[PDB]
Design an enzyme around this catalytic site. Sequence first.
Site, PDB file in Angstrom:
ATOM      1  N   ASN A  73      65.343 104.229 117.513  1.00  0.00           N
ATOM      2  CA  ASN A  73      64.114 104.937 117.839  1.00  0.00           C
ATOM      3  C   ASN A  73      62.883 104.227 117.299  1.00  0.00           C
ATOM      4  OD1 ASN A  73      62.533 107.085 118.881  1.00  0.00           O
ATOM      5  ND2 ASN A  73      63.059 108.466 117.224  1.00  0.00           N
TER       6      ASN A  73
ATOM      7  N   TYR B  84      49.859 109.863 122.430  1.00  0.00           N
ATOM      8  CA  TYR B  84      50.583 110.507 121.339  1.00  0.00           C
ATOM      9  C   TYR B  84      49.625 110.731 120.181  1.00  0.00           C
ATOM     10  CZ  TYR B  84      53.915 111.118 117.455  1.00  0.00           C
ATOM     11  OH  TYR B  84      54.612 111.597 116.373  1.00  0.00           O
TER      12      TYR B  84
ATOM     13  N   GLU C  36      51.883 118.318 116.956  1.00  0.00           N
ATOM     14  CA  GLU C  36      52.292 117.027 117.516  1.00  0.00           C
ATOM     15  C   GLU C  36      52.096 117.138 119.010  1.00  0.00           C
ATOM     16  OE1 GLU C  36      56.529 116.059 117.087  1.00  0.00           O
ATOM     17  OE2 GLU C  36      55.996 113.907 116.700  1.00  0.00           O
TER      18      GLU C  36
ATOM     19  N   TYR D   1      51.732 115.084 123.130  1.00  0.00           N
ATOM     20  CA  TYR D   1      52.124 114.000 124.022  1.00  0.00           C
ATOM     21  C   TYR D   1      51.533 114.220 125.423  1.00  0.00           C
ATOM     22  CZ  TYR D   1      56.337 112.444 121.256  1.00  0.00           C
ATOM     23  OH  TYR D   1      57.206 111.904 120.342  1.00  0.00           O
TER      24      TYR D   1
ATOM     25  N   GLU E 123      57.163 104.740 123.152  1.00  0.00           N
ATOM     26  CA  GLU E 123      58.267 105.312 122.394  1.00  0.00           C
ATOM     27  C   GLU E 123      59.525 104.863 123.075  1.00  0.00           C
ATOM     28  OE1 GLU E 123      58.226 109.293 120.921  1.00  0.00           O
ATOM     29  OE2 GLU E 123      60.117 108.816 119.963  1.00  0.00           O
TER      30      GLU E 123
END
Lengths: 184, 364
Positions: free
Chosen positions: A34, A68, A77, A79, A171
């Site tokens: 990741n 992001y 958070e 996106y 990502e």
Amino acid sequence: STDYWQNWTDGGGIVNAVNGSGGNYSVNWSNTGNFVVGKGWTTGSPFRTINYNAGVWAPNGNGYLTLYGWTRSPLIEYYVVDSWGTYRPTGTYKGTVKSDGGTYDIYTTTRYNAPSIDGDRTTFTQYWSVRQSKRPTGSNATITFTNHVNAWKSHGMNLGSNWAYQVMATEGYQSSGSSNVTVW
Amino acid sequence: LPVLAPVTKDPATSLYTIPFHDGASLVLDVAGPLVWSTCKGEIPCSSPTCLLANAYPAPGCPAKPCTAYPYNPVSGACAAGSLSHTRFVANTTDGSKPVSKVNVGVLAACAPSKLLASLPRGSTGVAGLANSGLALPAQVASAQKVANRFLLCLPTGGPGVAIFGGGPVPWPQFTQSMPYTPLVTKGGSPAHYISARSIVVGDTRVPVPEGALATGGVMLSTRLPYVLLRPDVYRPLMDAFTKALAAQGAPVARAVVAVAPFGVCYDTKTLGNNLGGYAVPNVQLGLDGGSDWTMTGKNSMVDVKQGTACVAFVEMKGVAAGDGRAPAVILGGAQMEDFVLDFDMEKKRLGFSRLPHFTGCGGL
């Protein structure tokens, strides 16, 4: 002009990320776990217009090409996903929003006792706008963040008052791929 | 069909539970050979049921109706108890969402209420998930005519997932390319073991005797939130870890007084935070099968008090370095959280997919 460099890996496989000139960055990866790489700004704004050009968008497996960012007060958070690889990210569906020639589904998710910019074990909500179909890359593109913020506001998804970083990100996970993005 | 129960991490104890029956839960014990619980206020001891029941003696207990010896894996306490039929009450599933209610008849030991010590509030005992005939996954397998196999998605918080019976792995967006590593059966143990060949901290690879990381030298447990380590492994891994941490004009990490039972602790005011948790070196367990098991801060650091997080590697006591009779590594719960784990005891392989940072077992 961008003032911030996001560059996080969990150390799985090879992630070669280049902090380029001005707003440009590239990522080449293989056999990852990741990672999140992006250029943007140290202090996000709900009135920012983010321009970018994804010269290269070449995932083999999962990856998102996405705005992001974070806020505090409260901790959020967020996106805005423009394109992706094999699987499209989803969540709890809330509604839609038209912006910058595309249409986006809006999702929330709650994250419990999870990592954030503020700590190790932290509880918070996640806001997503996800384009309904992959957005063309190679040409100059715009994300009018206000449109999203407003649509999010209308579905009871309020952002915080203290703004942290805000980047145009690549990502990737359980995948290989290449990215070359220029942000301003 | 396979059987689905949601999995709660208990805030106070850090142990994982599933609903059992009537507002009562059981602690998940992945090394535990028995389902046991306290009973409402007749198997012969020479029978196959009874032999399965005492196939793996409990450490502090020796051995005509049948008597089992339920083991509290947190206290180390054991006690005598009779076997008894009971209901495992859950939902069926065809992927990851509930189809409908179902009662599975399962054999469980009856424990005296004192063995509840140290367990979570609401828990009346332990669901053993080990590879033995009276563990819950085996019992559900025969009862429901499904695979002797189970899926764990241990959560950091919120409801995670336990599916008994196999069928296809859900969440292909996270599981499609799931790597496998053999399960190694060790003589006289029902626990699940796997084999690591290397540990990597940052880019620096850790120096252990070639073959102190041997076949089946890694055990999985849900008894402790942290990793237990044999001394030949502990000292090298911790040396490399504290160094890579010290070398990371950002604030350098300050060690504080160790907190029981940890060896190295830190002031959190002096630790950064990234998407993986506390900004400490990534750790890579190289498992057979060519894929690594990775630990980020969220896995390699435990919060203990406000102000203090300790390194989630702890030295095994009362064990000589390089002693093949003990596992070199015992991965625990925080190192398995936000992994989808497919324990397949029929093909004898563990599937492990690390969820990416933006999601987690909780709420999945």
